[PDB]
Design a protein around this ligand. Structure first.
Ligand SMILES: [K+]
Ligand SMILES: [K+]
Ligand SMILES: [Mg+2]
Ligand SMILES: [Mg+2]
Ligand SMILES: [Mg+2]
Lengths: 65, 153, 116, 117, 114
RNA sequence: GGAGGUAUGACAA
RNA sequence: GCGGGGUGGAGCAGUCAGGUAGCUCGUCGGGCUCAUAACCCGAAGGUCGUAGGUUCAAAUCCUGCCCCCGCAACCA
């Protein structure tokens, strides 16, 4: 739940890069656009309108709407 | 082959849905010529879709195909010392081939215990424009768009 | 700030295509190139990269306010036309097209042939 | 340290300063090594070579004064190292959520029949 | 639980008993038929009367540590008398005439490519 | 159609 | 006596500034080839010369000791 919060910018990039290589399932919440890009999200679940969707730059479309 | 294009053998329609596409789906799921098992999986899965959804399963399957069948494919071309992909339009026969291959292949990899459950879930997800089969179509279009510089080929 | 007439210089080589839009007096207003759109290597030389370069430079040029440009084409690159048409598509009015490929009337000795 | 400008300007000014500091420490080390190398050469020469032994002690004095004015390079702050690996293996269905509704007592329902896999 | 082994509580009795050393699929069916316990009941549902009947039934058979000592004594004997089979046991090679030029990995252990 | 110009591989057999 | 060195088969890092032993070539097994070389894929090979200390933990810091190499071991 917001892992990069409170972390210095250098440590954030380290966190994102290492998670990307993690060989397991990751349920993540993050308002930091850079961190999610490094992890390489696969599916995004939108709230409050439940929408299990494939991850893409359409994330921006949901943010706008 | 070198001589030229060959005859494509026709398939007869499904007995209960009166759809050739349903027969083609049955063939794709079939293993070792065991068509009885293949047909049972497809018909059970269309009954699951008739339960999770109130719509005609044949309608849901066709909507899944619309979201999965690709339009542009990448055709590897070897030019000199550089081998790069060339975007290519997919002929309608291959479109259903890829759609059936992708829907079946990713259903086999799903997590549900039984194939008909796995197939029904994969079909319904594709009908809603989500899931692995749709992601395979998105990547295929993504690859063509990137290599769109080689369209003149 | 605000222009009405200009000229678009399509510097298209074998390796890359640069599109530069100036006013009629040769003062630059906006420019793009295949290289600055992320294209690398052979991709920079393709007609599509030339097309994208023309678009990105055209839109910036029309943000300033610029209706009609004339085109000067230079170099042997394959992307000259894809740039010329891309200018028309994105909004500009291409009035004239000229070839300004430099030609020595002799001139200097060119570099050696690329083998031996 | 206080800079005028933005974050990038600070990084540019800082990176250059640490670069210029690093080069200073490099050249001070070379001169120390040079004296050290000659001091050793005199130290191992024959006791009969009076002048070289003399010069060796004279350079030993310069070597000492060098080593006492030699700026220490600040230890670069170490970055985090993470190696997260799972003990066991993931399944095709790690988590099953089916028709889950939840509301905090006295507030609107956040989601209704939430189901994902 | 039954013979000093916590048999799986969730499984059906016929299979749960198989987790006892010396009880196979056929032997489990025999003991349940003798005691009179249905084969389909999960052992979590076994009543103390049914469990004790199974324990009484199983106590008749040779299982677990008793069986393991019995078999090890047999192999021990083959080695002690110096029989061909005993040497096969002691040197980790197939004991029932199988060819060893290839395969024999179950007896030999992992391949030593050296 | 034709013509001048623009990596390694014994020896004998 | 003054220095420099001991880490996988060899040559080197890591040693100052303590946490996790690697890189280069080679070796072995399998590929590719008609075959060899080159190439591809896998594996092996050291608890850091050796023994005590310091520390939560040392290849690393400290100390000793044994080895190997360049100098020196006497000047009018
Ligand atoms: K044999
Ligand atoms: K074999
Ligand atoms: Mg040259
Ligand atoms: Mg058993
Ligand atoms: Mg035999």
């Amino acid at each position: 739940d917001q892992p990069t919060n409170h972390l210095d910018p250098e440590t954030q990039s380290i966190i994102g890069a290492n998670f990307n290589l993690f060989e397991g399932t990751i349920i993540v919440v993050s308002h930091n656009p850079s961190f999610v890009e490094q992890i390489g999200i696969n599916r995004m679940l939108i709230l409050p309108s439940g929408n299990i969707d494939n991850y893409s730059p359409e994330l921006l479309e949901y943010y706008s709407n | 082959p070198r001589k030229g294009p060959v005859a494509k053998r026709d398939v007869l329609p499904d007995p209960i849905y009166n759809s050739k596409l349903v027969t083609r789906l049955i063939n794709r799921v079939m293993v070792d010529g065991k068509r009885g098992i293949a047909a049972n999986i497809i018909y059970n899965s269309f009954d699951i879709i008739k339960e999770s959804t109130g719509n005609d399963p044949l309608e849901v399957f066709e909507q899944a195909m619309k979201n999965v069948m690709p339009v542009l494919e990448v055709k590897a071309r070897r030019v000199g010392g550089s081998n790069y992909q060339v975007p290519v339009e997919v002929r309608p026969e291959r479109r259903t081939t890829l759609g059936l291959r992708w829907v079946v292949n990713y259903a086999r990899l799903r997590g549900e215990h039984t194939m008909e459950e796995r197939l029904a879930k994969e079909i319904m997800d594709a009908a809603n424009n989500t899931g692995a089969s749709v992601k395979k179509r998105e990547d295929t279009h993504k690859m063509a768009d990137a290599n769109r510089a080689f369209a003149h080929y | 700030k605000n222009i009405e007439s200009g000229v678009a210089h399509i510097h298209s080589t074998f390796n890359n295509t640069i599109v530069m839009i100036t006013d009629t007096h040769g003062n630059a207003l906006a420019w793009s190139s295949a290289g600055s759109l992320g294209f690398k290597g052979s991709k920079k030389s393709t007609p599509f990269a030339a097309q994208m370069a023309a678009e990105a430079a055209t839109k910036v040029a029309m943000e300033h306010g610029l209706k009609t440009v004339d085109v000067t084409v230079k170099g042997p690159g394959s992307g000259r036309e894809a740039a010329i048409r891309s200018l028309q598509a994105t909004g500009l009015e291409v009035t004239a097209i000229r070839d300004v490929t430099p030609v020595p009337h002799x001139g200097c000795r060119p570099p050696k042939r690329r083998r031996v | 340290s206080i800079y005028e400008g933005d974050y990038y300007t600070y990084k540019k000014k800082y990176s250059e300063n640490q670069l210029l500091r690093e080069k200073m420490i490099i050249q001070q080390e070379k001169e120390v090594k040079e004296l050290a190398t000659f001091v050793q050469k005199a130290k191992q020469a024959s006791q009969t070579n009076h002048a070289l032994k003399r010069m060796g002690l004279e350079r030993a004095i310069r070597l000492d004064k060098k080593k006492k004015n030699l700026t220490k390079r600040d230890k670069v702050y170490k970055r985090v190292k993470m190696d997260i690996k799972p003990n066991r293996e993931v399944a095709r269905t790690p988590l099953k959520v089916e028709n889950v509704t939840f509301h905090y007592p006295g507030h609107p329902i956040l989601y209704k029949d939430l189901s994902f896999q | 639980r039954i013979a000093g082994v916590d048999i799986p509580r969730d499984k059906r009795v016929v299979v749960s008993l198989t987790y006892i050393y010396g009880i196979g699929n056929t032997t489990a069916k025999k003991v349940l038929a003798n005691v009179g316990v249905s084969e389909d009941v999960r052992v979590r549902d076994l009543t103390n009367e049914q469990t004790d009947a199974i324990r009484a039934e199983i106590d008749k058979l040779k299982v677990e540590g008793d069986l393991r000592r019995e078999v090890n004594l047999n192999i021990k004997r083959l080695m002690e008398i110096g029989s061909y089979r005993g040497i096969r046991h002691r040197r980790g090679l197939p004991t029932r005439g199988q060819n060893t030029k290839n395969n024999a990995r179950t007896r030999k252990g992992p391949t030593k490519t050296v």
